[PDB]
Amino acid sequence: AMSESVPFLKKPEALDSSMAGYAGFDPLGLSSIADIKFLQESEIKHCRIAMLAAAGSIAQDIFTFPGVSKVVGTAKMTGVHDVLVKQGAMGQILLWTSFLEVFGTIALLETLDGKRAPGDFKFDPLGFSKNAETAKRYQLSEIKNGRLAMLATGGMVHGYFITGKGPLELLTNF
């Protein structure tokens, strides 16, 4: 048993193909250190938050909701955060996500108990995961897109620090 993603390394002995997004990639042996269900839930959480963050960067560059331009002007990305901490916007977001995270704490503790799949909040209002094969295709897809957006978000915010522009106008200029 050698890793399919890193061939000169051994299989990481806590990862199995029944997981979503499995490529045998754990060279530092972290899946042996922490509990794997915690790591999976942390990965999906990071994935979804970063997908929202990347889309928000793109959309914020394209358009902005009515009235927002007056309160926050030339500021963009991290720059708006400080202005919107002065107003009540950021605090209200923190409050409602924190409310959701209390139940997510209870959900994660049930996951570590072994009664819930990681990332399973059973949220499927529109019907997409009716069929099993499509559920698997979506599960692999959502981890893949979330990973891509994790690196994306990283790149976008660091480009903002370097240039002061942000993702779309950084494409337009330079």
Partner 1 sequence: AKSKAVPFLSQPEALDGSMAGDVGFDPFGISSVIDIKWLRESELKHGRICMLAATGCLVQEVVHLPGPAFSQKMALNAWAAAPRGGMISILVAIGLIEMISNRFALTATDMFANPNRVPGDLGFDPLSLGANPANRARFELSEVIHGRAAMMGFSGMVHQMIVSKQAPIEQLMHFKAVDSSLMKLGGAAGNLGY
Partner 2 sequence: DTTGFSGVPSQFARPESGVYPAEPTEQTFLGMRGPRAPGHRENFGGKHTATMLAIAALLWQPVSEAGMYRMGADGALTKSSFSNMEVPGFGNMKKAPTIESLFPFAKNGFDASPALFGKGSMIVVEDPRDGCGAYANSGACHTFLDEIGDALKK
Partner 3 sequence: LWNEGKIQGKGVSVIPLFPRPASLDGTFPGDQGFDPFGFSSWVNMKFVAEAEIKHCRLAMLAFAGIMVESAGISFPGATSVLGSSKNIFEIHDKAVASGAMGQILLWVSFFEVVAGVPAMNEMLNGESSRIPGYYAFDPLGQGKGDKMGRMQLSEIQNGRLAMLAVSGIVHHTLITGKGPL
Ligand X SMILES: CCCCCCCCCCCCCCCCCC(=O)OC[C@H](CO[C@@H]1O[C@H](CO)[C@H](O)[C@H](O)[C@H]1O)OC(=O)CCCCCCCCCCCCCCCCC
Q: Does 38 bind partner 2 (CB under 8 A)?
A: no
What is the contact surface with partner 1 in residues (CB under 8 A)?
32-35
Binding segment for partner 3 (CB under 8 A), chosen from 1-9, 50-58, 87-95, 124-132, is: 1-9
Residue 127's binding partner among ligand CLA, partner 2, partner 3, none (Cβ under 5 to 8 angstroms by kind) is none
Q: What are phi and psi of 150, to 5 degrees?
A: -65, -50
How far are the Cα atoms of 59, 77, 160, 170 from residue 167, in angstroms, in the given order? 10, 10, 8, 5
Report what 35 binds from partner 3, ligand X, ligand CLA, none; CB cut-off 5-8 Å by kind: ligand X
162 binds partner 2 (CB under 8 A): no
Buried (b) or exposed (e) across 4-40, using 16+ Cβ within 10 A? eeeeeeeebebbeeebbbbebebeeeebeeeebbebb
CA distance 9 to 13: 11
Provide the H-helix boundaries in 63-88.
Answer: 68-71, 78-86
The answer to the question of residue 71 lying near partner 2 (CB under 8 A) is no
Which of the listed partners (partner 1, ligand CLA, partner 3, none) does 55 bind, with a CB threshold of 5 to 8 Å by partner kind? Answer: ligand CLA
**Window 14-73: residues binding partner 3 (CB under 8 A):** 27-29
- Which residues bind to partner 3, rule: CB under 8 A? 2, 6-10, 27-29
